[PDB]
Design a protein around this ligand. Structure first.
Ligand SMILES: [Mg+2]
Ligand SMILES: [Mg+2]
Ligand SMILES: [Mg+2]
Ligand SMILES: [Mg+2]
Ligand SMILES: [Mg+2]
Ligand SMILES: [Mg+2]
Ligand SMILES: [Mg+2]
Ligand SMILES: [Mg+2]
Ligand SMILES: [Mg+2]
Ligand SMILES: [Mg+2]
Ligand SMILES: [Mg+2]
Ligand SMILES: [Mg+2]
Ligand SMILES: [Zn+2]
Lengths: 86, 216, 21, 104, 129, 208, 128
RNA sequence: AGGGGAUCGAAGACGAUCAGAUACCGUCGUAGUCUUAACCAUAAACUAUGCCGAUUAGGGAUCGGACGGCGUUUAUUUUUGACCCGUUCGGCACCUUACGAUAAAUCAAAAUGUUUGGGCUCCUGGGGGAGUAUGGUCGCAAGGCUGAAACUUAAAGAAAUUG
């Protein structure tokens, strides 16, 4: 982002891919958002708090996004012993 | 002519005024398929036709003529787009071409040359694009100089809001239609370059489509 | 013919508009 | 332009191959380029099979077979209607045709 | 035969980053290579790197974190005075605000901006931005 | 266990259900991307999938399902005959639209067709036989969850459920368990231990 | 002698809207169609009655794809709740000896997950 | 220059076809087609794609060597040989795909190039005149290598589309 005197001058600030870090351009169809619910102690789903991930079309097209999602879920404590390095 | 009937969820949301401005649509990268969206947010979009060219096709009697039109739109302050359409009669071609031009409006990123003094005037980086044997490159330039470019692409840069730049072309630039599409791709890639000032992580928020409830 | 239609339409802003004499 | 990726020859890894004589016009073509057909048929036609059977002196008899391997140049190939022109996409299909096993 | 291990290393890094990997392997390792990596690290363009030590030459495994656009090498090592060093930054850098050109001088190899601060010149070996 | 309690471990009865439908049998072909979901390959035989990873991936898919505000935005697709009844019953029990049989290409892109939909999520039985649905999904930014066997394309598929994907019982059982999880995570079932009153064989296929 | 789309569409819509009042007899359908429809031609009315009476001859003997009438749909969703009393997957009743058969590395998989109490018998499989 | 000379067959001589047919078709037929001792050095000599080195995606075949394994077959029989399953090195190739490249046909290289530098050698600059004239050089000769100018022209040419 650019600045002149401490005030924002950019028209807008784009987001970044979680899997690879590339910026998702505008009009880049094929980039999706994944929303994960949050569960309580007795198993019910509390409404309105969720965890958001974004994947770009470039990373989606070759097809490893399923494994990237496994990596992120395991990092954030959503899954158990599903991803590992050989 | 008269008031329009929404067909998509986005159209209903705009009709109810549930979305603020175009930048969140750009942020979430949502497709646009309806030209009343752009002109509801952006009045005073100027349009200007380049030329009209006949196209032939052989038939028993002779040759069948169609007309192809080149149309671009822009607001001179960071929005620009173009459309291409051919039809059996010229007049239909101009009105239909304007629709695609409105549908293809994209935002541009404008940066600084050297020191910053408000109101960015030039490209942030040097960018170039190629479309079938035509390559056009844009280079940031110091404040004060005018646009150094061909008359055809000078209009596109004028309507895109860019104030200072250097231009260079390669390949067979004789195809005016292809040249404009190559310049449009180069300008389209301005937001695609990752400058060091964008390294800060951002927070992801839910899209308006997901968190709003549409009307029946 | 294409040139004829562009002047004839008189509903669009062309790049260059001739001024009669 | 290449009409075929293999140059219509099936020869990669060597420089030369001895030619053969066409079985119809006696032309010379490389062996790997020629079209080869192997044919197995009976000595006598199916209507005559019985006539040989009851004219034999060996009680039950089994007529012998006849085996030939003909090979043609491409010029004689599509004039004898052994093979025919295919479409652009259908050219790159080297599976043998499925012979009819029901015959309506 | 192998004529530039530096070129091999930067080419492998550029290919893996452009294709989105996170780890890279470099077969030959040298002192100039490691000194280049430290310059990249001091600006944050890469992460950890490891040099396994077999007795032949050693190897390198670099950890990538995106954020890197391209890193190339100039094969003929030209001689550049201090006065014309701005020609190169005008030539092969997208903008003056960011980007670095790597030089070799009598005070070790270093980037062009603090090398200008040190008021020293030498030979050019590569660049990255 | 930052974001999951210990009550979500699969019960013995569930694993029983899994191993009773022969859902752990794969094809000769082994995709490279499905290597993590492989226990061992049988000596002189097929690969074997790890059901333990199936349990969490199924729960994660249900957690994806619940995030949609109104159930009518979820769409479920099936083309092969073996999944028509199970998909329709899933649509009836939960809230979701179902597309069974022909897909009528252009459904997600053309706004004048009768079968015009604006879904927020797509669930697919088989990527290979439903490639057209995924291809058109790639144009307008909708995530897809799909059932996959040992050999299967992973093009544009964010979530994959390892399963037989070709058995008669396996497809129905997986669709039934997924529906059960969706209702369990909502307030419909009201309790984890209490059993559901619908019989698993309801999500099956009948010849006539 | 092939019938055009206008008759095809009119015959399908009449059959699905009004199934039971008309039968396989052509004479009855001749008077049924013109009373409940506005048709400008006598021969065209004959065209519709003649083809429409053909459909019920083959519907009477087995259903035909592409045609659905009020009686026909209701049969489907009454029949689709069929469900047995013992599950086909369930084997405690279906198999006389409750214990079932698996292969070796499947038993090893059970060992890994901890569900050892399942009663199964392991048999090796190999041909080579 | 010697030997050999079955079969085909430049040149040649006849028979037909044709308005003509020094050709296509048919019967003969010399040099040649083979070999020994010496010259000649050109081919659509083609993958029309120079040589060395690094990286980049999935698959299944297959030739040579090595390593592991459950079995079958078989012999003065075991270890070896044959068949089967999996891994690896080095080759002649093939199928799908495009994140990539090109004007396109198409390409795992024709990729890592307007964000342009790993090392080395050769060749081309609109079409004709022209691979011609002349000089030099090699060869018994046929010919090879090197190689212009005067003059003339606004188009030749490549890939693909509808007829
Ligand atoms: Mg060889
Ligand atoms: Mg040759
Ligand atoms: Mg003599
Ligand atoms: Mg002699
Ligand atoms: Mg002759
Ligand atoms: Mg003769
Ligand atoms: Mg030559
Ligand atoms: Mg050559
Ligand atoms: Mg060569
Ligand atoms: Mg062995
Ligand atoms: Mg031409
Ligand atoms: Mg041509
Ligand atoms: Zn022939």
């Amino acid at each position: 982002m650019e600045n002149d005197r401490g005030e924002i001058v950019d028209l807008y600030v784009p987001r970044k891919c979680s899997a690879t870090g590339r910026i998702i351009k505008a009009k880049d169809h094929g980039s999706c958002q994944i929303t994960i619910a949050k569960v309580d102690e007795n198993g019910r789903a509390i409404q309105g708090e969720n965890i958001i991930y974004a994947f770009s079309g470039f990373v989606r097209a070759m097809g490893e996004s399923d494994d990237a999602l496994n990596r992120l879920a395991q990092r954030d404590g959503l899954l158990k012993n599903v991803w590992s390095a050989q | 002519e008269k008031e329009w009937q929404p067909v998509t969820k986005l159209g209903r949301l705009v009709k109810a005024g549930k979305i603020k401005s175009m930048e969140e649509i750009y942020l979430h990268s949502l497709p646009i398929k309806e030209y009343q969206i752009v002109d509801y947010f952006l009045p005073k979009l100027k349009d200007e036709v380049m030329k009209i060219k006949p196209v032939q096709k052989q038939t028993r009697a002779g040759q069948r003529t169609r007309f192809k039109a080149i149309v671009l739109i822009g607001d001179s302050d960071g929005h620009v787009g173009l459309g291409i359409k051919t039809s059996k009669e010229v007049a239909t071609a101009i009105r239909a071409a304007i629709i695609i031009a409105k549908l293809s409006v994209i935002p541009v990123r404008r940066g600084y040359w050297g020191a910053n003094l408000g109101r960015p005037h030039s490209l942030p980086v040097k960018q170039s694009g190629k479309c079938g044997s035509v390559t056009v490159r844009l280079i940031p330039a110091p404040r004060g100089t005018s646009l150094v470019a061909s008359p055809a692409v000078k209009r596109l840069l004028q309507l895109a809001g860019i104030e200072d730049a250097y231009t260079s072309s390669s390949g067979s630039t004789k195809t005016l239609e292809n040249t404009l599409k190559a310049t449009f791709a180069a300008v389209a890639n301005t937001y695609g370059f990752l400058t060091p000032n964008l390294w800060k992580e951002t927070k992801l928020i839910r899209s308006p489509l997901e968190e709003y409830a549409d009307t029946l | 013919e294409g040139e004829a239609e562009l002047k004839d339409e008189q509903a669009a802003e062309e790049i260059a508009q001739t001024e009669k004499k | 332009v290449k009409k075929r990726k293999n140059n219509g020859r099936n020869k990669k890894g060597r420089g030369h191959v001895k030619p053969i004589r066409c079985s119809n016009c006696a032309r010379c073509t490389p062996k790997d380029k020629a079209i080869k057909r192997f044919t197995i048929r009976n000595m006598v036609e199916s209507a005559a099979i019985r006539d040989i059977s009851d004219a034999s002196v060996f009680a039950e008899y089994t007529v012998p077979k006849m085996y030939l391997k003909l090979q043609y140049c491409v010029s004689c190939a599509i004039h004898g209607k052994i093979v025919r022109v295919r479409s652009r996409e259908g050219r790159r299909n080297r599976a043998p045709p499925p012979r009819v096993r029901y015959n309506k | 035969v192998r004529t530039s291990v530096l070129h091999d290393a930067l080419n492998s890094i550029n290919n893996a980053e452009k294709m989105g990997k996170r780890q890279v392997m470099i077969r030959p390792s040298s002192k100039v290579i490691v000194k280049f990596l430290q310059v990249m690290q001091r600006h944050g363009y890469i992460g950890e790197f490891e040099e396994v030590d077999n007795h032949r030459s050693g190897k390198i495994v670099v950890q990538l974190n995106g954020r890197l656009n391209k890193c190339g090498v100039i094969s003929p090592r030209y001689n550049v005075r201090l006065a014309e060093l701005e020609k190169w930054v005008t030539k092969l850098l997208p903008a003056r605000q960011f980007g670095y050109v790597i030089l070799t001088t009598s005070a070790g190899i270093m980037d062009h901006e603090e090398a200008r601060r040190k008021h020293v010149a030498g030979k050019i070996i590569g660049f990255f931005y | 266990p930052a974001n999951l309690p210990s009550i979500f471990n699969p019960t013995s009865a569930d694993i029983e259900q899994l191993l009773a439908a022969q859902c752990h049998i794969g094809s000769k072909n082994l995709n490279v991307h499905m290597q993590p979901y492989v226990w061992k390959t049988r000596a002189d035989g097929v690969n074997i999938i790890n059901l333990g990873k199936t349990w969490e991936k199924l729960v994660l898919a249900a957690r994806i399902i619940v995030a949609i505000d109104n159930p009518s935005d979820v769409c479920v697709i099936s083309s092969r005959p073996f999944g028509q009844r199970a998909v329709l019953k899933f649509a009836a029990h939960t809230g979701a639209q179902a597309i069974a049989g022909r897909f009528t290409p252009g459904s997600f892109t053309n706004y004048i067709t009768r079968s015009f939909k604006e879904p927020r999520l797509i669930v697919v039985t088989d990527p290979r036989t439903d490639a057209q649905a995924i291809k058109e999904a790639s144009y307008v930014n909708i995530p897809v969850i799909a059932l996959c066997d040992t050999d299967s394309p992973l093009e544009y598929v964010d979530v994959a459920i390892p399963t037989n994907n070709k058995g008669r019982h396996s497809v129905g059982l997986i669709w039934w368990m997924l529906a059960r999880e969706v209702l369990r995570l909502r307030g419909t079932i009201y309790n984890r231990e209490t059993p559901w009153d619908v019989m698993p064989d309801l999500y099956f296929y009948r010849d006539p | 002698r092939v019938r055009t789309k206008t008759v095809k569409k009119s015959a399908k819509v009449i059959i699905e809207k009004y199934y039971p009042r008309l039968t396989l007899d052509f004479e009855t359908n001749k008077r049924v169609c013109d009373e409940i429809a506005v048709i400008s031609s006598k021969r065209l009315r004959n065209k519709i009655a003649g083809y429409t009476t053909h459909l019920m001859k083959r519907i009477q003997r087995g259903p035909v794809r592409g045609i659905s009438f009020k009686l026909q749909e209701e049969e489907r969703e009454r029949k689709d709740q069929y469900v047995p009393e013992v599950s086909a997957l369930d084997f405690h009743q279906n198999s006389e000896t409750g214990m079932l058969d698996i292969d070796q590395e499947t038993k090893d998989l059970l060992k890994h997950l901890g569900f050892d109490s399942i009663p199964v018998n392991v048999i090796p499989v190999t041909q080579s």
